Amino acid sequence: TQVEFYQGSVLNPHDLARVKIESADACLILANKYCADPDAEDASNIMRVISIKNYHPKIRIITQMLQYHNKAHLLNIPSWNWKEGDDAICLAELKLGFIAQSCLAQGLSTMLANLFSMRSFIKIEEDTWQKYYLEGVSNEMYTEYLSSAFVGLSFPTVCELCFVKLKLLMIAIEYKRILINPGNHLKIQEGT
Amino acid sequence: LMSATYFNDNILTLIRTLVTGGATPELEALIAEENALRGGYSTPQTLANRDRCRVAQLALLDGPFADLGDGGCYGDLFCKALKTYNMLCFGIYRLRDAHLSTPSQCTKRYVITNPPYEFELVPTDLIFCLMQFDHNAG
Amino acid sequence: VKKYDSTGMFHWCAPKEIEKVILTRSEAAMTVLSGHVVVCIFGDVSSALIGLRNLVMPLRASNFHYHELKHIVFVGSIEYLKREWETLHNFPKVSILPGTPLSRADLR
Amino acid sequence: DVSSALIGLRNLVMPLRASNFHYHELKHIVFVGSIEYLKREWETLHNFPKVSILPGTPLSRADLRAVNINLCDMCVILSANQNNIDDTSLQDKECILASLNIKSMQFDD
Numbered sequence: 001t002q003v004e005f006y007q008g009s010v011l012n013p014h015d016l017a018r019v020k021i022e023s024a025d026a027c028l029i030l031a032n033k034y035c036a037d038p039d040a041e042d043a044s045n046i047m048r049v050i051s052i053k054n055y056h057p058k059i060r061i062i063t064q065m066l067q068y069h070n071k072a073h074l075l076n077i078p079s080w081n082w083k084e085g086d087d088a089i090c091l092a093e094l095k096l097g098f099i100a101q102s103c104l105a106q107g108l109s110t111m112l113a114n115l116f117s118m119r120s121f122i123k124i125e126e127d128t129w130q131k132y133y134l135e136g137v138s139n140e141m142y143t144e145y146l147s148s149a150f151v152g153l154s155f156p157t158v159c160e161l162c163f164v165k166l167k168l169l170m171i172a173i174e175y176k177r178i179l180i181n182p183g184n185h186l187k188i189q190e191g192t
Numbered sequence: 193l194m195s196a197t198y199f200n201d202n203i204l205t206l207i208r209t210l211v212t213g214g215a216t217p218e219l220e221a222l223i224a225e226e227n228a229l230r231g232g233y234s235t236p237q238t239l240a241n242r243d244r245c246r247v248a249q250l251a252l253l254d255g256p257f258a259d260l261g262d263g264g265c266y267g268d269l270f271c272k273a274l275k276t277y278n279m280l281c282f283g284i285y286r287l288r289d290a291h292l293s294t295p296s297q298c299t300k301r302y303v304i305t306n307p308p309y310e311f312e313l314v315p316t317d318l319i320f321c322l323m324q325f326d327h328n329a330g
Numbered sequence: 331v332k333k334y335d336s337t338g339m340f341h342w343c344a345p346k347e348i349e350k351v352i353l354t355r356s357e358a359a360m361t362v363l364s365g366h367v368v369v370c371i372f373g374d375v376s377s378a379l380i381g382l383r384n385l386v387m388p389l390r391a392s393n394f395h396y397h398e399l400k401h402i403v404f405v406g407s408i409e410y411l412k413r414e415w416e417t418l419h420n421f422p423k424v425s426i427l428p429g430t431p432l433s434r435a436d437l438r
Numbered sequence: 439d440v441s442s443a444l445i446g447l448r449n450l451v452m453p454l455r456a457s458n459f460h461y462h463e464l465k466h467i468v469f470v471g472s473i474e475y476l477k478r479e480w481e482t483l484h485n486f487p488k489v490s491i492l493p494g495t496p497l498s499r500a501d502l503r504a505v506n507i508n509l510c511d512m513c514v515i516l517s518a519n520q521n522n523i524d525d526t527s528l529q530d531k532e533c534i535l536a537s538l539n540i541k542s543m544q545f546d547d
């Protein structure tokens with residue numbers, strides 16, 4: 001009841017019309033990260049993007065790019081708009097950024113990776129390292145518009161109130177834009 | 193990332209500004225225009241928007257965290273650090289054999305994400321920290 | 331001479347010559363490298379590129395103190411380094427060492 | 439690239455030089471591409487005037503700004519990779535990419 005499949009090529013406009021792409025909320029393109037020739041796969045994804053933008057230019061595209069120089073080609077497409085949500089997740093760029101962040105602080109790559117991954121709540125009877133690790137990993141990063149009761153306070157105050165009362169930990173907010181761990185001088189507002 | 197990139201469109205730019213270090217769209221526009229990075233003369237305006245929170249790790253073995261780290265709970269240390277140093281602890285970088293009674297020579301540590309308030313803390317633990325910045329340290 | 335980006339949240343310096351920052355066996359021997367970052371590249375003439383700019387870009391974020399920056403050294407076979415150097419000649423504190431990362435003498 | 443085939447660009451410039459047009463109506467010719475292919479085919483293009491060669495890639499915006507593409511009389515796009523690429527839909531790689539790149543270009547006047 002959640003997944004349907006259809007046979008067709010992205011380069012064919014009729015197949016794109018069959019799946020009612022004009023009413024689709026987004027289009028997701030997956031890449032073969034283990035191809036023998038990365039350039040060929042990057043180019044094939046480039047023309048998949050070209051075809052889907054040719055059919056519907058306003059559709060949202062979330063696609064993987066194996067290389068940064070091939071990623072820069074997408075920025076030259078007239079329909080490729082970052083404001084709309086055209087997200088070219090660059091595997092090489094993000095992996096190198098994670099490696100550099102691990103260089104700044106070891107063990108941060110796994111901390112970031114486990115946040116994006118949806119994990120259940122698993123317990124282990126015996127006291128091992130895996131028990132504590134699985135307890136930690138079960139936490140994911142979510143986003144929510146905050147309540148109006150908090151308005152009129154500072155971000156650290158709301159952090160303490162959420163951690164002590166609601167058992168919730170805040171890392172970033174929006175100021176009336178994304179602000180990561182804003183200082184005590186910033187004040188929360190309505191619709192945060 | 194895809195699912196996380198779909199259910200919240202700002203996740204990718206948050207990752208790029210927390211990992212790459214503030215990849216503003218002006219820089220992306222410049223890169224797309226030039227296909228590379230070129231030199232330029234200094235501008236005094238580049239010294240006011242650099243005050244952010246840096247990510248790093250800090251040790252509980254010494255310093256003012258030792259007293260609360262000698263058998264204390266995670267919640268008390270987190271609350272005290274948040275109150276005092278504008279800290280934000282989102283995980284513990286704990287040695288694999290730290291919880292074991294037998295003292296080993298192992299050094300590598302694992303990550304526990306978002307430990308509870310009543311979580312028992314070990315003095316030899318490392319925690320992940322978000323700090324401020326000062327512009328006159330050079 | 332560009333030490334901050336247009337927004338002003340990054341570190342950078344003037345371009346340098348290819349041989350200006352390359353350290354040989356002896357040049358690495360006298361020059362003491364401590365508190366730095368080692369990066370071991372494997373590849374050959376037919377190997378593909380990587381895009382190492384994003385590996386060094388966040389290390390240059392300006393929300394860190396300048397004295398907290400880290401030297402960067404790369405170790406690999408000189409063919410691949412000279413192949414990709416066209417995109418890495420504009421960054422400072424970048425050393426290139428020909429050879430193989432499997433050699434113990436190079437790592438010493 | 440180095441393995442790409444030749445084109446025979448003489449007939450591209452030959453009719454522009456027809457003498458039934460006024461001399462002041464002639465047009466400068468600039469080519470943009472990777473210097474390997476240009477030095478490969480230059481043996482048949484060293485005898486013509488008003489012919490500029492620019493190393494690089496046509497997908498680069500800076501190169502097109504240097505050429506002053508917005509001021510040109512006409513821009514044409516040719517790919518020698520139309521033969522080495524096996525997949526039919528992929529032989530129009532660079533032509534389509536560069537066409538969309540120039541179409542999406544923004545210019546200030």
Ligand SMILES: [Ca+2]
Binds near residue numbers: 138
């Ligand atoms: Ca969970």
Ligand SMILES: [Mg+2]
Binds near residue numbers: 002003
């Ligand atoms: Mg159904």
